[PDB]
Write a protein that holds these residues in place. Structure first.
Motif, PDB file in Angstrom:
ATOM      1  N   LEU A 151       0.822  -1.202   0.000  1.00 49.38           N
ATOM      2  CA  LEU A 151       0.000   0.000   0.000  1.00 49.38           C
ATOM      3  C   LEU A 151       0.859   1.257   0.000  1.00 49.38           C
ATOM      4  CD1 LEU A 151      -2.751  -1.070   2.607  1.00 49.38           C
ATOM      5  CD2 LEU A 151      -2.940  -0.941   0.083  1.00 49.38           C
ATOM      6  N   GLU A 195       2.895   1.638  -3.114  1.00 49.70           N
ATOM      7  CA  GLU A 195       1.984   2.066  -4.170  1.00 49.70           C
ATOM      8  C   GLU A 195       1.781   3.579  -4.138  1.00 49.70           C
ATOM      9  OE1 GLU A 195      -2.162   0.769  -3.898  1.00 49.70           O
ATOM     10  OE2 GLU A 195      -2.009   0.169  -6.007  1.00 49.70           O
ATOM     11  N   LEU A 196       1.523   4.134  -2.946  1.00 50.55           N
ATOM     12  CA  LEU A 196       1.393   5.585  -2.804  1.00 50.55           C
ATOM     13  C   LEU A 196       2.628   6.314  -3.316  1.00 50.55           C
ATOM     14  CD1 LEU A 196      -0.456   5.729   0.601  1.00 50.55           C
ATOM     15  CD2 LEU A 196      -1.219   6.771  -1.544  1.00 50.55           C
ATOM     16  N   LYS A 212       3.091   5.230  -7.422  1.00 46.89           N
ATOM     17  CA  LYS A 212       2.018   5.482  -8.371  1.00 46.89           C
ATOM     18  C   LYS A 212       1.139   6.671  -8.027  1.00 46.89           C
ATOM     19  CE  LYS A 212       1.385   0.748 -10.006  1.00 46.89           C
ATOM     20  NZ  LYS A 212       0.440  -0.404  -9.928  1.00 46.89           N
ATOM     21  N   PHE A 213       1.237   7.225  -6.821  1.00 47.77           N
ATOM     22  CA  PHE A 213       0.366   8.331  -6.440  1.00 47.77           C
ATOM     23  C   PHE A 213       1.167   9.542  -6.006  1.00 47.77           C
ATOM     24  CE2 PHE A 213      -3.910   6.474  -6.529  1.00 47.77           C
ATOM     25  CZ  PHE A 213      -3.645   5.116  -6.541  1.00 47.77           C
ATOM     26  N   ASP A 214       2.477   9.538  -6.242  1.00 46.41           N
ATOM     27  CA  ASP A 214       3.313  10.722  -6.106  1.00 46.41           C
ATOM     28  C   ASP A 214       3.486  11.176  -4.656  1.00 46.41           C
ATOM     29  OD1 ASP A 214       5.030  12.192  -7.536  1.00 46.41           O
ATOM     30  OD2 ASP A 214       3.543  13.598  -8.345  1.00 46.41           O
ATOM     31  N   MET A 215       3.464  10.247  -3.700  1.00 49.31           N
ATOM     32  CA  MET A 215       3.462  10.635  -2.294  1.00 49.31           C
ATOM     33  C   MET A 215       4.868  10.887  -1.785  1.00 49.31           C
ATOM     34  SD  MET A 215       1.293   9.212   0.942  1.00 49.31           S
ATOM     35  CE  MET A 215      -0.193   9.997   0.386  1.00 49.31           C
ATOM     36  N   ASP A 216       5.009  11.928  -0.979  1.00 53.65           N
ATOM     37  CA  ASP A 216       6.299  12.305  -0.433  1.00 53.65           C
ATOM     38  C   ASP A 216       6.602  11.471   0.809  1.00 53.65           C
ATOM     39  OD1 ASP A 216       3.932  14.163   0.233  1.00 53.65           O
ATOM     40  OD2 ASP A 216       5.258  14.528   1.940  1.00 53.65           O
ATOM     41  N   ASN A 251       7.483  12.206   3.895  1.00 55.81           N
ATOM     42  CA  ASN A 251       6.828  12.651   5.126  1.00 55.81           C
ATOM     43  C   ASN A 251       5.415  12.098   5.231  1.00 55.81           C
ATOM     44  OD1 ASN A 251       9.087  14.168   5.886  1.00 55.81           O
ATOM     45  ND2 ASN A 251       8.262  16.071   4.987  1.00 55.81           N
ATOM     46  N   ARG A 252       4.624  12.224   4.161  1.00 54.20           N
ATOM     47  CA  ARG A 252       3.261  11.696   4.220  1.00 54.20           C
ATOM     48  C   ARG A 252       3.230  10.171   4.224  1.00 54.20           C
ATOM     49  NH1 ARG A 252       2.624  16.334   1.347  1.00 54.20           N
ATOM     50  NH2 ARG A 252       1.157  17.826   2.303  1.00 54.20           N
ATOM     51  N   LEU A 290       1.324   8.075   7.070  1.00 49.04           N
ATOM     52  CA  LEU A 290       0.292   7.073   6.845  1.00 49.04           C
ATOM     53  C   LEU A 290       0.670   5.721   7.425  1.00 49.04           C
ATOM     54  CD1 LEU A 290      -1.064   8.022   3.320  1.00 49.04           C
ATOM     55  CD2 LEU A 290      -2.096   8.338   5.561  1.00 49.04           C
ATOM     56  N   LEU A 331      -9.407   6.637   3.823  1.00 53.57           N
ATOM     57  CA  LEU A 331      -8.260   5.832   3.418  1.00 53.57           C
ATOM     58  C   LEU A 331      -8.380   4.393   3.910  1.00 53.57           C
ATOM     59  CD1 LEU A 331      -5.250   8.300   3.810  1.00 53.57           C
ATOM     60  CD2 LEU A 331      -6.589   7.707   1.792  1.00 53.57           C
ATOM     61  N   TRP A 362      -8.341   1.269   1.460  1.00 55.04           N
ATOM     62  CA  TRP A 362      -7.275   0.285   1.532  1.00 55.04           C
ATOM     63  C   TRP A 362      -7.799  -1.149   1.455  1.00 55.04           C
ATOM     64  CZ3 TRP A 362      -4.210   3.150   5.934  1.00 55.04           C
ATOM     65  CH2 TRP A 362      -3.325   4.071   5.346  1.00 55.04           C
ATOM     66  N   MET A 368      -8.024  -1.669  -2.121  1.00 55.61           N
ATOM     67  CA  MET A 368      -6.731  -1.654  -2.803  1.00 55.61           C
ATOM     68  C   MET A 368      -5.963  -2.949  -2.561  1.00 55.61           C
ATOM     69  SD  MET A 368      -6.942   1.054  -4.510  1.00 55.61           S
ATOM     70  CE  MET A 368      -5.325   0.990  -5.283  1.00 55.61           C
TER      71      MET A 368
END
Lengths: 325, 325
Positions: free
Chosen positions: B17, B20-21, B24-28, B30-31, B35, B112, B116, B119
């Motif tokens: 998960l 994947e963020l 594919k989902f452009d997550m930095d 820190n985030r 999560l 979320l 999940w 997902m």
């Protein structure tokens, strides 16, 4: 005809959902009428651009590829209401953000509206070969949107993220995927034509249209008055990572940035006004015209690449763009 | 071994998960770490009775019907975490009920956690023939639960609904279907054995076990002290349609009903105490023993009907019942 057909299918979906509650979930008449009113309040009243877009894509792909027709357009109407109910769900969720039984009921409403998208799909598409692919693409866009909401709501914490590339990341996930890409994909699905189109060009087109829309929405939020905007724009008070803020920060002198930073994200009337003064004096509305004009050009160009291989689909992408432009 | 296997698959799901963020989902970063911490906080720490139940049903149906084994137990672990994440989602939703970025983040967390569950299913079960049937039964139980939450939260408005049959309606949908019926169904699914079992007996069994659990939970909420109960029981203040309230109303004299009605649903310490006095003096804890004993008998009897045609499945239904009884 499309709207009258869309509304006719709304009555059919609502009757299925509510009779399902009564007949299979033991619901009493008082609560059924309560849910009918909640559903009308949250799902009706907008423009249905997301839902009508599904209908338009479907008709384009059957005129430019008759019991299959009746079925495809009806399928398209149910998919349209799935998106409208998803939108209703996000709106309720936003309202909660801004022994209390009314807040309990709002949370419950948000759960029900999302579950209704599944319930209508499982019923009307029960025998369709695409039900599983439809659920998966719908769930993934729904996920995408929550991720984009996280990007948005946390953008001022963790002005380092006040950049254009991060603004575009917020727009892409929070807005573009479920408003522009999802109605298009859903029409392709009910038309059994998903594999026939360049999905990269299509995703690129949805991001661009979503960006065009959001920049305009951001500038109106600041500059269009409430009687003309239909609401009180509060992006400055909410310290949004808006197009105006990231564009100002790039062209402001250092003392102006300090003045911006001291006054942004405050409810104080004159601090909000100082921010609008900065935006005005930096000619951001001038910058807005040129920025939109250039997004438009890229949109126009990409529709034509799409049309070389998918002319019918491209025509409905063109119709959706006209509603935004 | 089951717990060590369940926790091993948690690490695998979390890594999928979160990567994947990122990918594919452009997550930095820190985030992503944010999560990961939110996921650990909300999903870990309970007893995992819902999730471990899926594992138990799966093992029973392969020992009492070897690369199919490894796959079935892994599938069962992913389904277990789907239920645990669903439970995490409902818990966050309850916490919200009882420019504020923390409430915004709680709402986002709830979105979320539910997304999940989809997902992880779409990824790990991508090639399974049951993915679509799994999504549908999971979504329907999730819907069921929201309906039951509505029944619960609105039970004191619309004491007319303070009846045993409506208490059972609340228990069935709010608790029984996702806590008892869903883990059992999910094990049957990953074992490709759903059609082999009497689903009516199975649904009847889940409602009965859920009722047994909830009556006990209701009586502890009132009578077990907080250091022993692990929380402050607030059903009286919250005016819950609890087992104690509907049972008292049937055996109270008219003046006692008036005393109950004047004092129920109040935060006042002595009005709450007057309610406990009424419950005590009506011997509700005496009535509790006999009520549970009779539910137990019906449970024991129905497991045997199930076992005539589904012995392996019945053995795991028996294991799940022992955890409650």
């Amino acid at each position: 005809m499309p709207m009258q057909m869309f509304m006719q299918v709304y009555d059919e979906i609502q009757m299925f959902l509510l009779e399902e509650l009564e007949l299979k979930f033991d619901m009493d008449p008082n609560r059924v009428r309560y849910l009918r009113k909640m559903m009308d309040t949250t799902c009706l009243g907008g423009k249905y651009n997301r839902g009508l877009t599904v209908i338009d894509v479907a008709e384009s792909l059957l005129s430019l590829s008759g019991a299959r027709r009746k079925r495809v357009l009806h399928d398209a109407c149910v998919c349209g209401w799935m998106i409208e109910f998803l939108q209703a769900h996000y709106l309720v969720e936003d309202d909660i953000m801004d022994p209390d039984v009314t807040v309990q009921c709002a949370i419950n409403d948000g759960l029900l509206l999302k579950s209704w998208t599944h319930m209508m799909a499982m019923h009307f598409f029960a025998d369709r070969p695409f039900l599983q692919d439809l659920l998966c693409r719908f769930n993934r866009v729904d996920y995408t949107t929550a991720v984009g909401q996280l990007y948005d709501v946390t953008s001022m914490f963790d002005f380092a993220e006040f950049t254009l590339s991060n603004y575009k990341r917020i727009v892409k996930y929070k807005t573009a995927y479920y408003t522009y890409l999802l109605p298009l994909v859903m029409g392709l699905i009910v038309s059994e034509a998903l594999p026939t189109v360049d999905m990269g060009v299509t995703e690129e087109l949805a991001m661009l249209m979503g960006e065009y829309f959001q920049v305009q929405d951001d500038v109106m939020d600041c500059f269009t008055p409430p009687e003309r905007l239909g609401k009180v724009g509060t992006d400055i008070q909410d310290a949004k990572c808006s197009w105006l803020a990231v564009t100002f920060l790039a062209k402001a002198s250092s003392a102006q940035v300090a003045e911006f930073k001291a006054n942004y994200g405050s409810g104080d009337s004159e601090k909000v006004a100082t921010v609008r003064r900065l935006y005005e004096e930096a000619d951001l509305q001038g910058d807005y015209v040129a920025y939109e004009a250039a997004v438009a050009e890229q949109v126009k160009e990409l529709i034509e690449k799409l049309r070389l291989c998918s002319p019918g689909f491209a025509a409905s992408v063109e119709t959706l763009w006209g509603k935004t432009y």
